[PDB]
Amino acid sequence: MITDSLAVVLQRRDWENPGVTQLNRLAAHPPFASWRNSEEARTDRPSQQLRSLNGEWRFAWFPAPEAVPESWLECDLPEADTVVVPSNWQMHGYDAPIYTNVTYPITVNPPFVPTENPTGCYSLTFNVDESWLQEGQTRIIFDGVNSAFHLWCNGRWVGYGQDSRLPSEFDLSAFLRAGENRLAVMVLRWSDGSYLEDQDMWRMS
Amino acid sequence: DEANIETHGMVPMNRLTDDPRWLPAMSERVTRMVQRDRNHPSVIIWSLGNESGHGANHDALYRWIKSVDPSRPVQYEGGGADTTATDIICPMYARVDEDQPFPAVPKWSIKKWLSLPGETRPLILCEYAHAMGNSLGGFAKYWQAFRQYPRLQGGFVWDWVDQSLIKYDENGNPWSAYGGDFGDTPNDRQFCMNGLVFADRTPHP
Amino acid sequence: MITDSLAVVLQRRDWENPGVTQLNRLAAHPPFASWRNSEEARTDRPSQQLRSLNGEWRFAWFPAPEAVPESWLECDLPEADTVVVPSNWQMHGYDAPIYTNVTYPITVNPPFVPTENPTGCYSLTFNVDESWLQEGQTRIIFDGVNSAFHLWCNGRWVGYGQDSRLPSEFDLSAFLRAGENRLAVMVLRWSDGSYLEDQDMWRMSGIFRDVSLLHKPTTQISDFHVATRFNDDFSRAVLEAEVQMCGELRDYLRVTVSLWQGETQVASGTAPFGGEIIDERGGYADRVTLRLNVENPKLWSAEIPNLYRAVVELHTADGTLIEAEACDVGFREVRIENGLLLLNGKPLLIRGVNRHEHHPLHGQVMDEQTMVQDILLMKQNNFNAVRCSHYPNHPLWYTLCDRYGLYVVDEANIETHGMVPMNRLTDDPRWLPAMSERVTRMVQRDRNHPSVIIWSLGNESGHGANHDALYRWIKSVDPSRPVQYEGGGADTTATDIICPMYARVDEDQPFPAVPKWSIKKWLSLPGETRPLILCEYAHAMGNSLGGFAKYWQAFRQYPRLQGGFVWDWVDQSLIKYDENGNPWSAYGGDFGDTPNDRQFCMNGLVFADRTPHPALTEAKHQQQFFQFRLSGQTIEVTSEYLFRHSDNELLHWMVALDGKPLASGEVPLDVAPQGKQLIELPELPQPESAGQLWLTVRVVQPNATAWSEAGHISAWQQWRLAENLSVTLPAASHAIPHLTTSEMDFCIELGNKRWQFNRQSGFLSQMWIGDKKQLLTPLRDQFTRAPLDNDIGVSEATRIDPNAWVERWKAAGHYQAEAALLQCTADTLADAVLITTAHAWQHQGKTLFISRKTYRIDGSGQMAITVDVEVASDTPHPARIGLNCQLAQVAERVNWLGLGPQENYPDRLTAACFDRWDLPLSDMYTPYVFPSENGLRCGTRELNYGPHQWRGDFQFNISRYSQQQLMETSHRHLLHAEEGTWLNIDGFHMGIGGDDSWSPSVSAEFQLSAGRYHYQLVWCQK
């Protein structure tokens, strides 16, 4: 699909350009549960249309986003490991966490970030219900990804997003298919958005 | 509710926030937050960010929130906490009687600040009383002033919980790690722990 | 290179995503010339580092961007053609241009655009100088590309950009190479940015502004600002100049700012880089502030330019200059105080006009000569302001306005008129990033220009949260200029001034949500303090500016009413060519475009060539800077000048009866600004000959000016005094007229002349002289006129509009009313022959008008026609009450005594002056592109055409084209000169209007609503 490939996506660097803060990301809104019953909505009963993807994912750490193998799109690496999502991979030992107050963890050269920025690859396997595909819309909701990431569904590029502390939502109606689906997320520790994020706290991605 | 914008490491602090090219990025950090959390009753105050100095982007983003949501007052600390981008005067760690004389951005006494020529806005300390280790000395002074002065409507203590990470000895026993315990440099050592309670979380005295 | 390939670039669609408005585009700034010499910068000498890429390029048109061949990157196509850049490819015939007012040219489905969007491929070959490559930076500057494009240099992708009306700059230092270089530009007609661009104009795409290459040094002046502060006495000024650099920063290098007035330097400032501490972190190290003291400076204004030259140069401490920048500085202050817009402490009355960058031959490409040509005509017609509507204009246009002296309102490129609602995008947070870049980049470019006094957020975009935020941003970055915005009712929080569109003087349009109040009422609304300046008013579409005097009477009376901007300046008509080859003006749907908004594109005060419309003399007279109040013998001249003394003015007054000068005099006009001068006239002669004396004064400019020739007339005024009635007895000649009565008709004979009256119709069928002939068509009553653009309104054949005057007249059956002869008699008095007739106009059994006439044939041959007309109340009032006929004779000249020389109407005749006028027949006809009623002269006491002569007070518009031919015709070039000459003598005529075109705007008193009308004219030969 050449355009879905990493080389094409990574060339147009989205994590360094201030102009591009999101790609194909849905509009912001209050948390939708999408109940199909008035009584379910009233008593705050768990919604059937809303599904938590929280659980065991396959994870792989990389020194740079360009260092990630191309074979990662179609299938996960054998060297990948199973860590819980949500989690910080710094507390998993993959890449040290850092605490700074005022000074940036990286060289102050806006909007550029270091060539070597720790890249976390997240991949998930799951079965979408058949009824979801026939009618309506499915969207994936990344409630928080720190600090920039590209999304791939079944090998095809979905979109891009930033700002770790707000939900990034992408329509997956076109990308999903019947049966097994795979979600590839390339999470980048450093993004031009890090310049807007210099809070006195531990830096984790 | 505070927006995810902080450019404390920049020189000057408003280098990005006074840059028109960085306006599109800052707005999306503010607008998307308001759209998500405007329904919640508990939220009473919007915040533009933290330490980002005072730029033209702040005034524009301040005006935007007032336009979309006149229900909540908007506060911002940067620029001396008396700028046009804040509905409330919110100085950081300002003192009760003695006032820190700084160029450009002077920190007045919380009693003196109210009495400044042309001041009508109330004063709420977004940050005050640094609870780093053995602190809260003279904390009674603040609350004597809070109850005496009508326009002094209290403030927010920094901080609630020590941001200490747990590490493990060679023997296996866990110990609290701070700052540069993860082999990270340059770091800001134990300054990460300014909470009123520990992390387990045990209350400090 | 795969990534540089079209397939990869086009997949990531940048022209549809609102988030992506630019890629790898440099920062906005004022026009950098990058001089390497201080003297070159000072005298504005052409820069060697700046290179114009204007010239012949290779061009190829495509139905879709994806349709473009891949081989285009490395080499140009053989099928490519050579067209000039800058240009619109629509005017090259590659892709039809389209005119729409409100509706989008494409399907409203934001942010998506049609799959088939016309793609223009531009390619250029050139040789970059070797010295440019070795050191410094080169950047290409696309001053204007309409509306989105991807750039390729030597096959490799450089970047992407939008917003057609602002310069897109890309660094080409890395992409360029030694020798031949190729620049591939894929320009797309439709982009998501088109949703922000729905201005009432012809839609054209392509590189329509200049393309250039700029070389800068390694250490450069990336940006610089110029501000002016003043003491309250306005006698002491400080020029604070902030300077930014792109470094490559070091301690030794300096920046020197010096002010030059001609060849003299009034001030200078040298300081090391570094800003004052502004935060806890400190100040800018790469910036520097230089404030220069200027004592008793010359203040910039439209009346008196007084420009200063500031040279900003970055230099080493030794010292050699690295780079030199220059800028024109005008010292003025623009601030609203106590609810009044002020310039230099004086309230400025805005006599401005809205102007579109349009050329009939070159589309929207603007040459230097046309910018000068327009400015001169504006100032020569008492215009001091110009509103670039509704987009950032040419960077040179601001320069010209600085030196000539014109108030400029710089408007952002945002207009979403086609959306439903109008603020759908502007109240959308996701569209905020796109709108801000259309505003911020404009301010950064045009903040140095003195001529610009007012910022504008856009046009019709409703009121959204984005406007309030963008308004607040401009106020934050530039408190020097007030910000205005019309959307949301022109009283929103996003405007410093109340700027209603086409609002009226007395009657107020009651609309839900957004009500349009009277300009007088609007000020008086509870909680109103802001001044009112009409961003748009007086729609000059075709025959307009009726009741235009009402606005300017209100402007001078009401302090907070500081005038407004007229729409429009020039007709946006395109030139097309017949099969015979002869050129003709095209409008709206003449280019095979649908849906379109027909002739609504032409609302200018002048044509496109550009010839002044007759409405332009009305604007000039109402905007004149000298008022007049006659008090018997003494004249009083009040100067409306705020800053300049009448140093070059010459008052000339003529006193004439019947157009015959009886006295004349010249007085040196020495008036102070906002002052009044009393001028006594010598005792005037009393002409024993009966008639009406007229006192006409005029203000003449003896010495030549940069914008006007010597002997120029700026202001004039005419009074009426000492009327002498004639008690003379015309009767009676020795001879006596003779009639012969027959069953067929009526025949009257007097000497050589013979008059014949048809008994079947009741109208006189033929007149005679000699051995001679007269009429080509019988003289009948006329109650209609050719529908003006104002009469038509927005009514079309597909859409019937009940409110329009033309439709009310069609339903009433005025045009189709047949004359019914109810009575016809003929008698002979002792002195003269008198015939009495009476007609009636009936539509579907209902009588509309009843006309009774009593022709009297004097013994001298003079025929006195007494016409008494009754109009029904139920019927809409007639456009005119009139006599009309077709004269078989075609004389070359037309001599008349009345208001002239140009055409004038009851609604618009204040500019016209009463005198004996003589003009060719062609001058009596106004060639409006859309045919209608024209060339009317009011207050005419005597009309001489050939042997014929008509006396009495009437209105006439003698022409070669009948009223029936004009309304049926759609264009002016289709008009054929009918046999003989058509004459319409109307005793009464309806006002033409109007405030706006889309709604009936004729005032009540100007309408013919009396019910009964009477007029008498004496028809004679020789």
Ligand SMILES: OC[C@H]1O[C@@H](SCCc2ccccc2)[C@H](O)[C@@H](O)[C@H]1O
């Ligand atoms: O202890 C952190 C505090 O730092 C200070 S600034 C400088 C104080 C500082 C700087 C470097 C190391 C330790 C403290 C901030 O104002 C507070 O909000 C808080 O983040």
Ligand SMILES: OC[C@H]1O[C@@H](SCCc2ccccc2)[C@H](O)[C@@H](O)[C@H]1O
């Ligand atoms: O003649 C154009 C004018 O249209 C009107 S709106 C509706 C007026 C209209 C609409 C459609 C066709 C013709 C006129 C605008 O307010 C003016 O600025 C100007 O653009």
Ligand SMILES: [Mg+2]
């Ligand atoms: Mg980015």
Ligand SMILES: [Mg+2]
């Ligand atoms: Mg901080």
Ligand SMILES: [Mg+2]
């Ligand atoms: Mg776009």
Ligand SMILES: [Mg+2]
């Ligand atoms: Mg419009």
Ligand code: NA
């Ligand atoms: Na209190």
Ligand code: NA
């Ligand atoms: Na801290």
Ligand code: NA
């Ligand atoms: Na006035």
Ligand code: NA
């Ligand atoms: Na128009």
